Structures are given as C-alpha cells and as structure tokens.
C-alpha cells in the first residue's frame, strides 16, 4: 500500500536456532538483559514479532 | 491470502495425477530453480506424496 502494508510479521529473537522443518507461533517477551522481563516490555526486554 | 513466514502453512497433496508442465502458464515466474531433480524430467518420476 502507498501508506504501507503492516500485515506481515517475522521472528527475530530466540534462545537458539531451530531444527530444519519446524515452526513456532508462540509469543512471549524475550529476556535480553539482567533485568527480568516479567511482562509488557522495557529496557533489555524485546518483543520478538 | 498467503501466510506469514513465522506461521507458514503446510499443504498436502496425495492420490492424484500431476502435470509439472502446466504450471508455467499459472504464474509469470522465470527462474523455477530446483535442487534434487531437473525440471526437464519432473513428469516421469513417481513419488509418494
């Protein structure tokens, strides 16, 4: 779209690379620092999608 | 409608007669790069599914 199509998502953050021919549609807040990622988001807290 | 990369959909084909040469007119693609078998002799081998 001229405004922009935002309907397509992808995964960026994971604990490790997955094996060939597997999928994972689970959504959770990745921990990217010593500060715990209890919920929502924050510094050193990344939403992978 | 096509699925997203993180939620790709698996579609199965079984118990039919295929013709891998009719797909040229379906979409305006050019490369059709293939790995394990030559595109020349796709309609001669017999698969499982």
């Amino acid at each position, epitope marked *: *779209k*001229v405004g922009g*199509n935002y*309907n397509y998502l992808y995964r960026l953050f994971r604990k490790s690379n997955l094996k060939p021919f597997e999928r994972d549609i689970s959504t959770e807040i990745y921990q990217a620092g010593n500060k715990p990622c209890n919920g929502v988001a924050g510094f050193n807290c990344y939403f992978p999608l | *409608r096509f699925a997203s990369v993180y939620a790709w959909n698996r*579609k199965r084909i079984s118990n039919c007669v295929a013709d891998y040469s009719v797909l040229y007119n379906f979409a305006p693609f050019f490369a059709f790069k293939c790995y394990g078998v030559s595109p020349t002799k796709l309609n001669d081998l017999c698969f499982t599914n």
Partner: antibody
Amino acid sequence: VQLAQSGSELRKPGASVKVSCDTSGHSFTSNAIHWVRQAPGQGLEWMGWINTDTGTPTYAQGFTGRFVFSLDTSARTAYLQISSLKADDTAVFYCARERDYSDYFFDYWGQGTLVTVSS
Amino acid sequence: EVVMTQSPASLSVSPGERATLSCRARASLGISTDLAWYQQRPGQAPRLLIYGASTRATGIPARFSGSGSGTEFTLTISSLQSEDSAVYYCQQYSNWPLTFGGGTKVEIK
C-alpha cells in the same frame, strides 16, 4: 453504497460507449476498483480490476482486449470503454468497491449502468 | 478453478416462512469460510448480505443467519417480506478466478 454512475444510453452497432464511476462519496481504505457485469436475465460474472496508484488493469478469461479500464488524473473516477458492440452485448454494468484492504467482498456498489444495442 | 453449483434454481414461497438455500463449491481443498452472500432486488444493484462464514455487515438486520464450513454452506432466513423479492448468489474469495454462483430465484407470492 450509492457511488454516482453514468446513466443509460442507446447505441448502434459498431459505436463506442463510455461509462464512469464516481468515487468521492465516502472514504476508502483500499487501492482498487472492481467491475461486475450481469446479463439481462442471467446471473453475475466478473471481468477484472485495476490497481489504484499503479494504473495496471487485470482482465479475466472471456473479457480480454475489447474492454478498457481507465482511471482519472486524481485516480478517483474510473471510466469504462467499449467498442464494436454486438447484438448480444446488451447487459448491465455495475461498479463495486472494497470496504477495507484485503477484504475481497464487495460492499459499495454503484446504481448500475444500462447499455442497449438497437437501431 | 473453483466453481459453484446452486440448488434449488428458483424459490416461490409466501412471505414469513423459513427457507434454506445451499451453495456448494466444487473444490478439492475446500474454501474454509471464504464465502459471501448477496441479495439483488430487480432494478438497483446487488447489496451485501453476509461476509465471512456467518458474520453480518453494517446496516443489515439480525433476521438473516448463516452457517457452514469447509465445502458446504447454508443460509437460513426468517420473517420473509414482500420487498425481499430478489435472486440470491454466493461468491468465493478463496482463489483468483473470482466467480459467482448460479443463483436462487426467490419470488414473493
């Protein structure tokens, strides 16, 4: 819902017909316009669509070549052009518009345009 | 390509009686709730009736109800009215030979 569409005309064989489809009545979260044709006594059948902001038409199987889809300089008013009318060419031509993006069901429809072939 | 078949061809029932129409699509892999219903009174253009499997659009009363899944779909109506003289069609937005059904010619006695 009530997009302004051109009225009916009477045409002789071999002439040309111009049909417009005004759009500015409402607000649209889409970038396409569609056309629907109906025979005088039969059902509905599609012909194609053109992409707004690109001006690229798309034709169906049995409605290629002779039909012409055009847009406006503002890319809002869509015009339909046909030439070399036949005796069986008489039908009604509608103009359908999408509701939201990637929602391929038509909600906004023009009132319809009638084309008659006679002498 | 996906093509519909619709029966019965025509309907002639007095107003106020429940009626059911079936639209079946001949597709090996099905449609998966990608169907819509349309109502076209003589004269004016067809107006949207039901989009999706059963959801209703804006400005339509809750009189109409629909159901179906996979390959077969059925429409149920109640409290038929005189002004509902129209021919009902079904459309699949599943592939990109966009086509319509054969239609059901519903007549008010």
